[PDB]
Design a protein around this ligand. Structure first.
Ligand SMILES: [Cl-]
Ligand SMILES: [Cl-]
Ligand code: NA
Length: 129
């Protein structure tokens, strides 16, 4: 599913991401914009053989099992394919564990390079929340 900006902001808010670990909603929307263009079906293979999945491009290296990432972990206890669902629950629930992992949203390299330190509130401006 490809979400509209405000539609995903509302879904993210409902699932508890607004100010989760201190990150206002626009940070979550901005990260999703640049990680997947708001497409729950996005996937992207990494050079080490791991794959990123979903609206927040969660990596199989640590967080989910895809049966093809040698030596990886499944810290979120879920098959990576669950992160591609039109239902964002798993992506949100696993992103909550990642952002609680000590590095905050720096875990998402696109957030660090394209959202951090910017006016992220613009990503939810105008949305009914
Ligand atoms: Cl594996
Ligand atoms: Cl933090
Ligand atoms: Na894995």
């Amino acid at each position: 599913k490809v979400f509209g900006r405000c539609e995903l902001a509302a879904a993210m808010k409902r699932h508890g991401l607004d100010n989760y670990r201190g990150y206002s909603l626009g940070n979550w929307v901005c990260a999703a914009k640049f990680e997947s263009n708001f497409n729950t079906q996005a996937t992207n293979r990494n050079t080490d053989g791991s794959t990123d999945y979903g609206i927040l491009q969660i990596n199989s290296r640590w967080w989910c099992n895809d049966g093809r990432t040698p030596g990886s972990r499944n810290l979120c206890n879920i098959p990576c394919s669950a992160l591609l669902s039109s239902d964002i629950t798993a992506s949100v629930n696993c992103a909550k564990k990642i952002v609680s992992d000590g590095n905050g949203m720096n875990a998402w390299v696109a957030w660090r390079n394209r959202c951090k330190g910017t006016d992220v509130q613009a990503w939810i401006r105008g949305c009914r929340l």
